[PDB]
């Protein structure tokens, strides 16, 4: 797909085929965060299990419905 985005947007990498396809985005889909870089801004999966929106890879801002957010992590019950 597209290899370099407009200077502000984010590249999302997909392997829906058996080829690697990029797509340019203003934000990033759920489960991903906007990783800003000097070279290339990209969408990167959050590393927190069941996180829908995140600040960084290890800090969630929105957990899956039914879960409890505490200090950037998702819990099945309030800690």
């Amino acid at each position: 797909g597209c290899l370099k985005c407009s200077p502000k947007l984010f590249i999302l990498l997909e392997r829906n085929d058996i080829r690697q396809v990029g797509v340019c985005l203003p934000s990033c889909p759920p489960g991903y965060f906007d990783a800003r870089n000097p070279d290339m801004n990209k969408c990167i999966k959050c590393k927190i299990e069941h996180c829908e929106a995140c600040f960084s890879h290890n800090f969630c801002t929105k957990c899956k419905e039914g879960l409890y957010l505490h200090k950037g992590r998702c819990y099945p019950a309030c800690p």
């Binding site: 502000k8 600040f55 801002t61 200090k71």
Partner: protein, 300 residues
Amino acid sequence: MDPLCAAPCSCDGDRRVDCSGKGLTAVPEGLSAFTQALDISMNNITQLPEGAFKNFPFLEELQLAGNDLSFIHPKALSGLKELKVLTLQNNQLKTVPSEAIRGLSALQSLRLDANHITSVPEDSFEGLVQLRHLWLDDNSLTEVPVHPLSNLPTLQALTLALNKISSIPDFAFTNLSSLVVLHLHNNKIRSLSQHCFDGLDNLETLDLNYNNLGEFPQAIKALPSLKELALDTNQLKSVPDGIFDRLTSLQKIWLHTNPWDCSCPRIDYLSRWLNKNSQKEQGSAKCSGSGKPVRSIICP
């Protein structure tokens, strides 16, 4: 079937409105007062006038990213007492809009990244008694905004990455007692004062990579909760002996892409620590010249 909408937005029945990517120059007229979320990102709103959101008293989420916003009327955001999320990334802001956000007492998340912000007025962030997440990355800040940050004891997540910060003075983050994650990577930090991190008692993650650190940051001793420390891609040559003795919370440390001086007995403590704590090092610190891993060094 949007009983409470206006062209050319959609109103998804859960009181969320989407007007993003519509070429708009203003907030559309005729939107419902029931509205809880408003997405007006990716338009051409360059200015927000007074009372632009007057008819949205239950608004919880306002998305303004990707406009070319350069002026916010001090009263544009009046009456938004329920607002929790404000996104202003990718706009043309030159200054943190201190006064316009002053009355946002319920705000939890504020995105000011990827603007062109060179200054933050002293009174910024007063009134933000519930703020948890603050993005200031990819702007033009040349220093940490000390007095404005002192207003945010509830803050959990802060990024000042991809700015132009060259040094951090003593007590720069002293009131940030709830802070869990701090990003300072991709600046030009050469000088960290001895006590720049005091008061960060809850800090778990500290990112200092891609800076210009010539001397190891002694200031990290004041971080009892530290779990993750990135110091990769700096100009570090040595660590002081015993620097990690009191960091019993450390789980991960990045030390690679630094010119480690592997002379004995200077490299003694670091080599031994990396060998005893092999599980904690991410990637490999290498000796300058040979490229030998620092953990493979032994001093007699």
